[PDB]
């Protein structure tokens, strides 16, 4: 009921290898979250990887903006709950996507105690990360819908828990920085130093500059550059 | 064991009479074993390994040592003591120690290539404890 | 005739690739330009 040509895959789900080998299967395995026949193709993401496959069908994933086998995203890399309830996502995402997803899951013969395959276990010989946290407990359908994620609340509270600015060069100038501070409020004493390519700004009672501390934790992206920010003295040292 | 030929060995099977009986007893002991421990197919590798050992012993007794006659080699091939395609495959210069005949057929692998059993160890990866799933070893 | 033969074969049976990842791949798994 649903054939295609190429999978809508991730960039990490494909693998850390520029040449992989897919294997199309016309009408296999019955899509996880809509129960429809679709075109399953698996591959090997890299050496000693997990032989990843394709779960969520073409219309299933294309409609809801999500990858066919991890349900995170093609545009960002966040879950489908964070990218719906929550912008903040751009500083919340990551480049260089960890290949801790494409690895074999835990050898249950080892967990019981007698993994007979010895060193030849094509599974993975670590200990099972304890059951108690709800990141032992997520499923597919609750993940794929926005309703009830164990991950998305735990990453959504990373989004609200947690001055020497430099990296000026030839893009940042003094008037652009003081007008980007002018929307926050008024100055008391500002300066720009060019031997270290840095700027010093203050505020009446911080606060407004406090959300600048929310704005500039490797996050204030003006003039196409990730600016460098660490703390000032505030101690007359 | 039954012969089903009624030929009575021209040069005599006496030379490799006992080795064939020991190989048949080992094959019967391997086939009489249960499916305990093996996940899906790991118990079927020993019968193919015993068949490959019997074929290599027959090839070393017939071609390498040049002790038995060609009539005895033909009688052993017609009886079942060795394979015909394996003796032709091991006679090539490109391979003389192949794992099994399930890794040489190009239509067996899903990717349309050869298996990992017939691969060079110097050209492969350093860290690899992989074995042939259809043959048993590499 | 080729299209009708393919349609008749489908009715009888019923009754490499180079894709550039130009979506999010910029620095994560660096080197993937043709895949």
């Amino acid at each position: 009921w649903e054939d295609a040509d190429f999978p809508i895959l991730c960039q990490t789900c494909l693998g850390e290898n520029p040449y992989i080998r897919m294997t199309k299967e016309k009408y296999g395995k019955e899509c996880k979250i809509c129960a429809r026949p679709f075109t399953v193709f698996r591959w090997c993401p890299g050496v000693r990887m997990r032989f990843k496959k394709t779960e969520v069908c073409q219309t299933c994933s294309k409609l809801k903006n999500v990858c066919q086998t991890c349900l995170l995203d093609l545009e960002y890399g966040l879950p489908i709950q964070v990218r719906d309830a929550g912008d903040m996502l751009l500083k919340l995402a990551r480049t260089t996507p960890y290949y801790k997803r494409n690895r074999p899951h835990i050898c249950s013969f080892w967990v019981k105690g007698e993994c007979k395959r010895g060193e030849e276990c094509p599974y993975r010989h670590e200990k099972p990360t304890d059951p108690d946290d709800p990141l032992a407990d997520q499923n597919i359908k609750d993940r794929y819908y926005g309703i009830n994620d164990p991950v998305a609340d735990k990453l959504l509270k990373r989004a609200s828990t947690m001055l020497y600015v430099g990296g000026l060069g030839d893009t940042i100038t003094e008037t652009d920085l003081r007008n980007h501070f002018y929307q926050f409020g008024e100055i008391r004493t500002i300066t720009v130093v060019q031997r270290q390519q840095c700027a010093f700004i203050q505020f009446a009672t911080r606060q407004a500059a406090e959300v600048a501390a929310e704005k500039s934790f490797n996050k204030l992206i003006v003039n196409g550059r990730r600016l460098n920010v660490k703390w000032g003295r505030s101690q007359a040292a | 064991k039954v012969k089903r030929s009624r030929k009575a060995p021209p040069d005599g099977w006496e030379l490799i009479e006992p080795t064939l009986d020991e190989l048949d007893q080992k094959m019967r002991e391997a086939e009489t074993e249960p499916h305990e421990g093996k996940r899906k197919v790991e118990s079927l590798w020993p019968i193919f390994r015993i068949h490959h050992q019997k074929t290599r012993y027959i090839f070393d007794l017939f071609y390498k040592r040049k002790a038995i006659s060609r009539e005895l080699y033909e009688y052993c091939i017609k009886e079942g003591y060795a394979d015909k395609n394996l003796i032709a495959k091991w006679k090539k210069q490109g391979y003389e120690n192949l794992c099994c005949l399930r890794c040489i057929q190009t239509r067996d692998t899903n990717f349309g290539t050869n298996c990992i059993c017939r691969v060079p160890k110097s050209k492969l990866e350093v860290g690899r404890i992989i074995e042939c799933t259809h043959c048993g070893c590499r | 005739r080729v299209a009708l033969e393919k349609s008749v074969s489908q009715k009888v049976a019923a009754a490499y690739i180079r894709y550039t990842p130009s979506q999010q791949g910029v620095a994560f798994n660096s080197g993937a330009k043709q895949r």
């Binding site: 080998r21 | 290539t113 050209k123 | 690739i17 180079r18 894709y19 130009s22």
Partner: peptide
Amino acid sequence: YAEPAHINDFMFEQQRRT
């Protein structure tokens, strides 16, 4: 953006192994 190709089998697999 995906498209077909008609690429060298041997060198594809060789670079993969490498």
